[PDB]
Symmetry: D4
Subunit: 208 residues, 8 copies
């Protein structure tokens, strides 16, 4: 079974030092504001489980969404800048997680299953995300084919689908639409599920 | 679920610079008239989305069928010769397309879901399709193994099945039969679905 | 859907110059009498479609079962020795074939869907099948590691399952049992489905 | 169909000389006591069919669970130390098999489908399982780079799932819970199904 | 032994339907005038033996240098335009071949071993070499990922080294310098030996 | 060091069950008469060491040249037809072996180091070598993709070079020329060294 | 020819987006002072040509040695901390480079061909090089499995050998010894040539 | 340059966790007496550097020869049974090492460069080396693919050639012959250099 009428997913059977998936956007990743939603079905959540992470050479923490024991942490700009939802994490159940960001005044937010879960102001005000980064799902940026691999602790185990990124802050109506029962045909422009190239590596598999 | 009782398809999870599928006919492709049907289910359509393309080194535009928004364009001989349907394609729904051609008087036709959608005369009159070319599905003839790859804009994302080519012009009764509820055992002679060799590349997958 | 109770099959999506599957028995193939059954679901039957073939260096035609239009030909020893059944096999439907042989005075027989279809006597009398040959399904003995070589005409396209070989002549009760609705747990000793090693090559797939 | 709501398994289509799966625990395997459960569905059982085996360089028989006809043999420390269940395993049916061990004075036991099947005392008393060995499923350590090497007789053919190892002797309530109808979310700490790395080799396949 | 003091070459042990080498320039190939030199040691010269070829999708004959028995044919723009030096090639001996082109008035030349061998005027006057094509050595453009494809007759067998391309017509002094005994460090800007990426395919080998 | 000024060879470092090299002639192998020479340097000569072998499906012994303990055996048509030299082969020394055949009257001969060593008459008179077989060096025809299969006893260990085949019986002057110190540029038409495709397999290596 | 007494090297025939070599030290790279020498023969030096680079996740610029036209730049800690020897490099000639660093007082030095070329004080005083980074030769850490992802401008083209790293500042006598004609047996402890694992990638190859 | 006139060797450029070479004898390794000689040229000799090792499942130390700083240790049967020569091995120069064993009275010996270096009596008296073990050069025991790897400490770095094993104790004259300047043509029967299959893995490569 699949969450909202989507017909494809990616399976992480296990968390190891080689498993991850890489995203290749078609247009530059420089952003003034953005939105990014995804579907998750977690098997085991640890001290810090990376869902997706965008990072550059000088700063590996440009954008980062990950799960703690019972909370969702959304990071923009750096570690000190983070927004935390309280007690809205589950295991073995499909759940939708969307979050927006605006650089004009640092408005960031988190929505879980179509309902606001967190919000703050004056986060990374005036910041701009640069180009030339590496976008990944299920793992953080680190050496590949060199060194011991990735940190086995931060990896992800479960299923992912519906990974979309927009170049603007979606309105409330759009955000509730994206999590609906017929929401798998609306895809973002920077990244879209089904049109953008996503290459599983190290053991991740496409499943239909 | 697949249409007309077919039990195999090909999946294009993404449109990238390396994804395509190649067809290897058993007999020469030299033709004076031909017919070609296919089942398609598109995910996203750009200004030009190649379904299948046949071309030699001298002329890469011998035969070509592609989608542009809600229109269907059928090309024989070159760009100047093209037949266009208006609003006969959707997204996320299985649809049957079949095109007809005759070099004796240049009669071309397009049928969508068993109904005539376009017709023309004096198209490539007296022209003979050469032999020894290359036939792909979902991509256009270009540098495949080495180079800059293909143009990602023209690639295809979705599902395809039931790709048949005949060496003659099918009659109206045969054309309506081919899109029937039990038409998946009607295969053409130049190319037949299930007997001819089709090799997905670069990320395309059989869904058998 | 699988024929009787089996939960694994092999798919030949296409007939080409590279597709086949090889069988590696655990014990010698030297035999004075044998029985062999199989499930087939043919897509397109040509003038000679090989199902399975056992051949040695000096004689590539030791044992051979194949289809020719709506007829079944069973060969032991050589071409001159063949048993033919008429109007037995159809396309796109699961059917059970099983052949019997005895070297004492050449009793050979063919059963289709549990019913006798042919029988003859004094075939290859006194002949002993040698050992050290190559056993294959869906193709005939020929060079394979030269980029091809296999005759594209004789190959097979469809699904196969339940390939068993016994070292003796099964009785009538056993033969009718092997084609029942709870027969997939009855496996032969020389070759058994799910116990013996079978390696698809060139495009054949397991469709468990 | 899979047991206890598990959504993944590993398939052994055959027992060749190269088929096995390797487990890579995160933490050391030095144990004073342990408990290890698994789901199995066997196709054919020989004189000795290995399910999982842990062994070091000096002692290849540190821990071993295997089937012999209709009996289950559990080995800790060597051949002389074995516990045998009489007539409590079948073919083609999912069955749960757990077994605990205590090093304090050698309490070992076997449970089949949540019911005690065997028990003994004073087995490998004072023994400590070393660390730095190799853990495998479906085969015994012989060598994977000798052009094969594994003895085909001992290999396994069927399906496996739910392989967990704990660092302590589970209580009776815990064991009946693990064998329950919704127990697939109860995973052990030394090895857990879905979090620990398991790499099928030589023909074994993940199936969903 | 290699000429002019070069430590590397490329070996074509044989001419088949897969052997070639591809060049990946760092800057666009759009040119108004150019020069291009190379070292050859031919084993067997045929009716037409391609040394290097540049071609686009529309026009596969943009630039070509090839050997025809004991002659050298230099092609710019198309097949109709060609310059033929005559009686100035051998087998099994290193030889240097350069040629310049100017689009302002269509001046073309050919130098063999530092001596002018041919010259013409009004060749492809006003023509501009497009950009975005494919550059190769030892073969023509189309025929990859087709199961061979390349014409076995036109391929090359021997050794090549010192392949350089400039963006301007080299003067006479520079041309005589390039074929000197200390010229292997004189590399062009569009393509340079030892700086530009040249990856052999299909059986070609780097040799030192 | 290599003989007669040849600059390439093939190394067989070991005789195994997978080592061999395959030849792909451009034109058909149907022959009325032929001549075939080769350079050989043997490391260990066993009861029968294959140099090159041509065989079809129905007759694996069409043409065969191999070495015995101290003799060279040349076979045309079948095992019963063979010509044997007596004491004219050594180990670790380059030696030229050439033999001709004529079907008009069955004249066969063997030359070793430019000197005639054997001759016979009425050998395979009226025979014609079929076409569509497999040509190999260092091994005899047998299954190769099965996984090993080749009999290690008959394999070859050493170095080979200068393998040429003509379509006619070379005269005495040509035969003495082919073994000279400036002969490595004399290549045959059916097969030529450095022009015909010869791809080693299983551990054989090109060496320069 | 090799520089002093070494018998292996690594060849970079070209600079592309994939070529580099990775080093796997046996012991941790945490250092308070170090020395590092290398043999280099450059083909083309650009605005910045990386020889070797050590960097962590938070700081890709921990240690760096690279060539800029006719100068040598040695970097410890970050960009602002650099030592620049000037006019001490050529092209196509073997040259020995070695630099030392001390964290107690920030003493850094550069030696070229056994002669001091630069010296500085108060460079990264009190700094400790972290551990758990990635060490590479000929490239900078940017990305491996993202379809290249290496800046082609910074790559290296030429030959390298004798890469050693010590855990202490070598004395003047040791430094002049390391560049001698009998020095290839003097290997460092953190990294040693011929003892430490160095696996080239993307086109680099060992040569001996 | 190689010793005694041998054309091939094996290179171990590094000490890693995956480098080794495996030997596949033709006949059983069951022995009551044997001899085994080899040519070695060590780069760095650590506390224990394995040259070759034969071991079975129940006993990984059946036969073992290795270097310990400037000593040579020869092991038959187990750890307690060892013969140690002293000051006999250096670094960077080729040296011949032979050793014989007799089970009748437990006579063991070691020769270095053709001169006796050690001798003992009553070593493994009455012992018989079992059959079905695994023979390797440069590494101790298995773990190649998924065990995690080998112990990098025991690996070997340098060059090896001339590895021969006889089934009997060679006489003194034979032993001095085997280390001569024309000794590369005499090879053992159980294992012979050039006829037996030796397959380098993980980085080792043949060199000529
Ligand atoms: C979980 O991660 C946080 C990171 O902020 C860390 O502070 C905390 O100690 C971790 N908790 C456990 C139980 O490891
Ligand atoms: C689509 O292509 C046509 C060429 O036929 C061009 O005229 C048109 O501008 C294009 N439209 C878009 C949206 O790119
Ligand atoms: C089929 O093969 C048979 C050989 O028994 C031959 O006689 C017949 O002509 C063939 N028919 C066709 C249609 O190829
Ligand atoms: C089954 O294994 C047992 C192990 O104790 C041994 O007797 C023999 O190998 C087999 N016995 C039978 C009756 O097959
Ligand atoms: C050589 O090629 C030329 C191409 O212009 C052709 O005209 C000519 O016939 C060829 N010669 C031979 C002998 O094939
Ligand atoms: C060598 O081969 C021949 C083949 O004719 C055989 O007759 C002979 O016995 C063999 N000799 C040995 C010693 O194996
Ligand atoms: C060379 O690199 C330096 C880096 O400091 C830069 O400032 C300079 O502009 C570069 N020179 C050229 C010609 O690119
Ligand atoms: C060298 O190895 C031997 C093995 O017997 C060991 O006893 C000894 O301590 C080692 N020496 C060093 C310096 O580690």
């Amino acid at each position: 079974w699949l969450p909202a009428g989507c017909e494809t997913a990616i399976l992480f059977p296990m968390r190891s030092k080689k498993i991850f998936g890489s995203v290749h956007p078609v247009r530059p990743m420089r952003l003034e504001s953005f939105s990014a939603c995804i579907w998750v079905k977690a098997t085991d959540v640890l001290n810090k489980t990376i869902l997706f992470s965008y990072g550059t050479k000088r700063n590996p923490y440009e954008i980062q969404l990950y799960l703690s024991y019972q909370s969702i942490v959304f990071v923009v700009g750096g570690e000190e800048n983070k927004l935390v939802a309280e007690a809205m994490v589950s295991l073995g159940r499909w759940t939708h997680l969307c979050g927006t960001w605006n650089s004009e005044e640092g408005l960031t937010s988190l929505w879980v299953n179509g309902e606001l879960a967190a919000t703050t102001v004056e986060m990374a005000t005036g910041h701009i995300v640069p180009e030339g980064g590496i976008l990944q799902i299920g793992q953080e940026k680190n050496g590949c084919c060199v060194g011991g691999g990735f940190d086995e602790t931060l990896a992800f185990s479960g299923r992912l689908t519906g990974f979309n990124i927009w170049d603007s802050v979606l309105s409330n109506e759009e955000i509730r639409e994206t999590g609906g029962a017929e929401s798998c045909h609306i895809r973002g422009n920077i990244v879209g599920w089904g049109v953008t190239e996503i290459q599983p590596h190290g053991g991740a598999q496409y499943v239909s």
